[model samples]
Target chain A: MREYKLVVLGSVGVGKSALTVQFVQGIFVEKYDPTIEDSYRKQVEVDAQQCMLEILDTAGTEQFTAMRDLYMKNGQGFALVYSITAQSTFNDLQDLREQILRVKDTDDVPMILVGNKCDLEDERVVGKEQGQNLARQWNNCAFLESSAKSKINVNEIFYDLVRQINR
Target chain B: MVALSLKISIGNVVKTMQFEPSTMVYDACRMIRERIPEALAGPPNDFGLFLSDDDPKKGIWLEAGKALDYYMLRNGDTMEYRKKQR
Candidate 1:
């Protein structure tokens, strides 16, 4: 079986790990913390094809920049996650992409721009068009939204990324 | 209890149930407490203790992880219960 690695990146408490758990285990955790990091490894079969995924979720604190870098350096690609309720998180994606580009020094690396908490549309500050425009700036990446609490678009993100990997 | 994934999707969009976790657990516990005592007092006779084939409550064994565990019946696998089935 082939191995795929993806890193989930966003500001603290932006629901990165919750999204991961929802997609992998189909359970919604009510309370999630960003101070503690986690790695989930799962073996799955899709369309009769077998594959394994190693997902690294980080706290992304300034003090832990080195640790974050270490996780990024070892991963194959990234899933750039942001919170729709938090506008600044959407703005901060560029810096993370730049850092990944510098470290990997490659333009063809796969990265998906994900806007989390789509279920909270009433409190949303980031527009769907804005996210799309930003994704267009990065030619290969696609833009989408997800809510782990509702399992909305949860599996799609992972399956879409796996398809991209196969492509 | 068995944990199974429930898929609620139409076309391309998927939806999940966001029930309150605490309340779900609490209600299940309450239901279990009320039923366990009644399950223990079943008659010692083959048909009385265990749910007989003719009885309305034939299959009341506790299900654990998609499999039936021990039953509240006195003679769950006895000939008397089998005789009722015939």
Candidate 2:
């Protein structure tokens, strides 16, 4: 099985925990028990191939810039997240996105733009088109929305990351 | 003392220009303005010349006071165009 090491970055309350827990736990007897290091890892099938996925998330640790650098240093792929309910969260991603490229020393790093909280469309502030336009500005690094509450496109997000990481 | 062909790579876009390194780094800057005005196309301070590698993470911007010709002193030693980091 191939291994994909992934990193998740986002502004506060963008459902970073919600999305990761939904993808990693899925009623599997753990929402997130941080005591175990491998708790963030999972085995899944992507593109009809079995793969091991390890996810590193920057949620409560947003203040630690060093940890952010360390995460990018080891992560093979990444997902950038923002809540559709907050525009500043959306705005913050530009530098986060550039930092990854700067750290990686390459422009086309494996990445995805996640406009989370699709289930909160009634309260959305960042339009779907707005996210799409930003993705285009980043040379079309796959933009999509997810709602961990609704489990919308959660698997597809990781699967696309697998494809891009492999590419 | 000799004019040599110099190359400057900007985001992998390569430009070859003629430069004589005996002049100070500032003169090299001036040479680019008169020789290839459109390359950087901005005020001199906005960009800088640096000894570079294909890896963007590592490079040394040539010091303005040094005779840059001696630093890049030979053929095939190319420089890069980088916007001032601040």
Candidate 3:
């Protein structure tokens, strides 16, 4: 079985845990209980290929950029997440992406720019076009908008990343 | 005797309930316990009630002894109560 390691990076309350938990258990959490670090594993079939995914959910550790240097080195792929309701989280991704690129020592690392919490339409502060444009500016890295609460595009983000890593 | 409509979200489960405007926060807490069996399973005063629109990170707490109408909650308002740490 193919094995892959994935790390999720995002600002606080951007639904990192929700996304990872929803992807792994199909469950969404309503409360904003900050997470330190949680790891999950699942056997998933993507593109007709069965693979084992070891996912790292980093919910409240954005303050520790030094710690994330090791995560970048260890991860095979990454999901850089942001909340649609918070523009600061979206703006923070550029620094995170840059840090990952620096740590990975490669500009072509497998990663995706994820805008989460799409269910809160009235609360959205980031536009789809802005996320798309940022992705394009970052050498056209994969981009997806998802709602962990609604289970929209949650699976696709993970599947797409695994495909990218396998390539 | 006017009743209020509320949408209460707990652990990803959203429930709709009707309550008298004069209901005390303690009664509302009891209602949450009835609807969600595990809501009050933890230590006392470990949960907080807040408007759904309010920041979950900075949740507004509900005073149990006060009247629900004291919170100025309106019709179709979303209320969320979560198990919080001290």
**What C-alpha lDDT do the candidate models reach, one value each?**
0.53, 0.64, 0.68
Q: Which ten residues in a row have the lowest lDDT in candidate 1 chain A?
A: A30-39
Which segments of model 1 are wrong by more than 4 Å? A62-64, B1-86
Quick one: how many clashes does candidate 1 have?
A: 1
Q: Note the DockQ of each predicted structure.
A: 0.02, 0.01, 0.03
Query: In candidate 1, what are the lDDT values of residues A13-130, reduced to their tens digit?
Result: 5776677666655556555523334445567776667877566665455433565687677646577777887778888877888888888786466668877778876787774566
Q: How do the residues B4-63 of candidate 3 rate in per-residue lDDT, one tens digit apiece?
A: 556555544334344666677777766665433345566446775676566656556677
**Residues forming the 10-long window of minimal summed lDDT in candidate 3 chain B:** B9-18
lDDT of 2 by residue, A6-107 (tens): 777777556554565556545211122111011145678876888975666654342334555776776577788788888888898788777788788775
Backbone N/Cα/C clashes per model: 1, 0, 0
i-RMS values of the candidates, in order?
A: 17.3, 25.6, 15.1
lDDT of model 3 at residue A12? 70
DockQ metric, candidate 3: 0.03
Q: Where does candidate 3 clash, by residue pair?
A: none
Q: Rank the candidates by DockQ, best first.
A: 3, 1, 2
Each prediction's TM-score against the native?
A: 0.61, 0.59, 0.63
In terms of TM-score, the best-performing candidate is 3
